[PDB]
Ligand binder design. Structure first.
Ligand code: SPC
Ligand code: SPC
Ligand code: CA
Ligand code: CA
Ligand code: CA
Ligand code: CA
Ligand code: CA
Ligand code: CA
Ligand code: ZN
Ligand code: ZN
Ligand code: ZN
Ligand code: ZN
Lengths: 169, 173
């Protein structure tokens, strides 16, 4: 795993998230579920808890975008960069952006929203790209048919606990 | 990507550089622009920033030299070795020297100063020679045309970020 104990991690255990907009690719219920599931992968092995907001600035602002979208890193059309996120902090830090030029799907027939969102929130919590190839934090989208086999790698758990510790239970 | 033995890296996130002398090959402003652009490629993907000094010792002392020049490794005349730089650290470390027996150029008609300067500053920041053929840090200068297309390869990016991490306000690229 790769962390950089200069860069601040979140100073609190309870984080807020807000889904700012929805992709035409999927039913709003699936976006909500994918995000919820992605957040749970991390709450499970740390003492981090999350709550949703519908107005104001949540710590982790989640949005779909295309090309230029208000930050210094424009998306690139179809494929390649699927989404990006910023490490802990105020403002844009902790935010996660998803490229709508990708076809977001609940299965593996396009870009699986859940898996990429899980990786993105990784970034939102202070995790950087892992060198380990089976890690969720590995920067490579494998059109991984077996979503039924997904499991956070020991590397991912080791990395996120390095910053926040284990769950209290 | 490779690092120097022992992972030396700068501890400060902000470094100073000073251009000590100028080559007869190019006007001074073109030398300055090539160096600025060479520093900029790395600034863009790390938390590192740089500031120019015009007197005294900057972390990264940049100079043109020929044959013996006051250090352990004399240059070798036209061709072959083009420049050499030192790993992060005090004094001579972090410095970058360019062989003036090469024809330093703004384009590809001679040895592109920008390109070799970018590889040298790589060295000054802690990166060693990549075994990956398309990495700026591959130790071979080549028959490249499009300077316009220039972008650090992922291997160079993963190298320098393994050392410094990415820009604080930026995603990992
Ligand atoms: C080294 O840069 N690589 C990158 C930059 C960007 C990324 O990691 N964003 O978080 N891409 S990506 O968008 O293709 C990507 C994003 C999420 C992911 O989840 C499993 C795997 C790959 C891969
Ligand atoms: C033993 O290493 N081989 C070497 C030693 C020396 C070097 O790497 N200086 O940094 N050379 S070189 O001078 O030919 C060289 C320098 C810069 C460069 O930038 C794109 C490509 C090649 C190639
Ligand atoms: Ca894209
Ligand atoms: Ca935020
Ligand atoms: Ca879409
Ligand atoms: Ca020095
Ligand atoms: Ca030479
Ligand atoms: Ca010359
Ligand atoms: Zn963005
Ligand atoms: Zn990523
Ligand atoms: Zn020298
Ligand atoms: Zn070199």
């Amino acid at each position: 795993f790769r962390t950089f104990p200069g860069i601040p991690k979140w100073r609190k255990t309870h984080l807020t998230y807000r889904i700012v907009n929805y992709t035409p690719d999927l039913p709003k219920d699936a976006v909500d579920s994918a995000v919820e599931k992605a957040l749970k992968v991390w709450e499970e092995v740390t003492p981090l808890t999350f709550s949703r907001l519908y107005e104001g600035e949540a710590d982790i602002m989640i949005s779909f975008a295309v090309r230029e979208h208000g930050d210094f890193y424009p998306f690139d059309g179809p494929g390649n960069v699927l989404a990006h996120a910023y490490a802990p902090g105020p403002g844009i830090n902790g935010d996660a952006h998803f490229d709508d030029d990708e076809q977001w799907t609940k299965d593996t027939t396009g870009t699986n929203l859940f898996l990429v969102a899980a990786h993105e929130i990784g970034h939102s919590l202070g995790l950087f790209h892992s060198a380990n190839t089976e890690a969720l934090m590995y920067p490579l989208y494998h059109s991984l048919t077996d979503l039924t086999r997904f499991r956070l790698s020991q590397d991912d758990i080791n990395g996120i606990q390095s910053l926040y510790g284990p769950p209290p239970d």
